[PDB]
Design an enzyme around this catalytic site. Structure first.
Site, short mmCIF file in Angstrom:
data_model
loop_
_atom_site.label_atom_id
_atom_site.label_comp_id
_atom_site.label_asym_id
_atom_site.label_seq_id
_atom_site.Cartn_x
_atom_site.Cartn_y
_atom_site.Cartn_z
N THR A 1 0.85 -1.06 -0.05
CA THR A 1 -0.09 0.01 -0.01
C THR A 1 0.86 1.31 -0.01
O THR A 1 2.07 1.27 0.41
CB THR A 1 -0.89 -0.02 1.21
OG1 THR A 1 -0.32 -0.02 2.46
CG2 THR A 1 -1.89 -1.15 1.26
N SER A 2 0.32 2.54 -0.63
CA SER A 2 0.91 3.64 -0.61
C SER A 2 0.96 3.96 1.00
O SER A 2 0.04 3.91 1.69
CB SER A 2 0.24 4.72 -1.37
OG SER A 2 0.35 4.38 -2.79
N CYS B 1 7.51 -1.42 9.51
CA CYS B 1 7.06 -2.60 10.43
C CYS B 1 8.16 -3.47 10.57
O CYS B 1 8.94 -3.49 9.85
CB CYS B 1 5.90 -3.17 9.84
SG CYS B 1 4.25 -2.15 9.84
N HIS C 1 7.69 0.53 4.08
CA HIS C 1 7.37 -0.84 4.64
C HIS C 1 8.43 -1.61 5.13
O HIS C 1 9.78 -1.26 4.90
CB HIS C 1 6.67 -1.52 3.57
CG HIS C 1 5.36 -0.79 3.24
ND1 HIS C 1 4.03 -0.89 4.34
CD2 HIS C 1 4.80 -0.34 2.21
CE1 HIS C 1 2.98 -0.21 3.70
NE2 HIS C 1 3.27 0.03 2.47
N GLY C 2 8.24 -2.56 6.21
CA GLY C 2 9.41 -3.29 6.52
C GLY C 2 8.90 -4.56 7.06
O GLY C 2 7.58 -4.79 7.31
#
Lengths: 231, 4
Positions: free
Chosen positions: A28-29, A129, A87-88
């Site tokens: 997701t953006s 994350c 993100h992660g």
């Protein structure tokens, strides 16, 4: 007992701001991340860092940028700062088209691989994350791994929270504490204030019960060998 | 509020 912050330059602050990901990745953006990136830019500018913002980098571009920066001459620089917004997963941050190991990124700056940063603090601040857990809350002369600090937004294994309007809980709190305390507190004490702010002042609101009323605690990993003062 |  205190790192020399007396060099002609405070150092580089590299900000990697990944908002939009390749459709095929299904990621997701990250609405609100631009607020983080601008907040950090101004925050670190005030601390006299040479800030470089980079947006939407592929995993290949991330590695290449880090390699290139690590190859620069940091002789006249007191320190080095890298901020990663993306993100992660555990041990991983996402380029726009796939993952990169955090270890691969930080390795470029090892005491033996980046000679002009040896003995200088190397700071990595990571809003990403680290898994999918939710917190419900309750009522050679020097080691090559020395002089790194990693300030993670969240506990290992856990999601990290970002507000689409205000920015991430962690970056919001980090910039606020730096603004208020960088002229008065050692960095670990500043980061402890950030821990408390995130832990106490934030709690998720969601229409989805699974994601509602959740909490967050950042995590400081310090392999620093001296106190770090920004003044 | 969203997760990363």
């Amino acid at each position: 007992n205190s790192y020399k912050m007396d060099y002609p330059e405070m150092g580089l602050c590299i900000i990697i701001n990944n908002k939009n990901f390749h459709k095929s990745t299904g990621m997701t953006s990250r609405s609100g991340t631009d607020v983080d990136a601008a907040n950090l830019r101004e925050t670190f500018r005030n601390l006299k860092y040479e800030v470089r913002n980079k947006n939407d980098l592929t995993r290949e571009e991330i590695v290449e940028l880090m390699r290139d920066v690590s190859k620069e001459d940091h002789s006249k620089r007191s320190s080095f700062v890298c901020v990663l917004l993306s993100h992660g997963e555990a041990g991983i941050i996402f380029g726009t088209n796939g993952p990169v190991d955090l270890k691969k990124i930080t390795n470029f700056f090892r005491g033996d691989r980046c000679r002009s940063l040896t003995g200088k603090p190397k700071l990595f601040i990571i809003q990403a994350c680290r898994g999918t857990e939710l917190d419900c809350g309750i009522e050679h002369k020097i080691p090559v791994e020395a002089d790194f600090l990693y300030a993670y937004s969240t506990a290992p294994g856990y999601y990290s929270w970002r507000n689409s309007k205000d920015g991430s809980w962690f970056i919001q709190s980090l910039c606020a504490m730096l603004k208020q305390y960088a002229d008065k507190l050692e960095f670990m004490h500043i980061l402890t204030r950030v821990n408390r702010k995130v832990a106490t002042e934030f709690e998720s609101f969601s229409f989805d019960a699974t994601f509602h009323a959740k909490k967050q605690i950042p995590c400081i990993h310090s392999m620093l060998t001296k106190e770090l003062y920004f003044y | 509020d969203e997760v990363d």
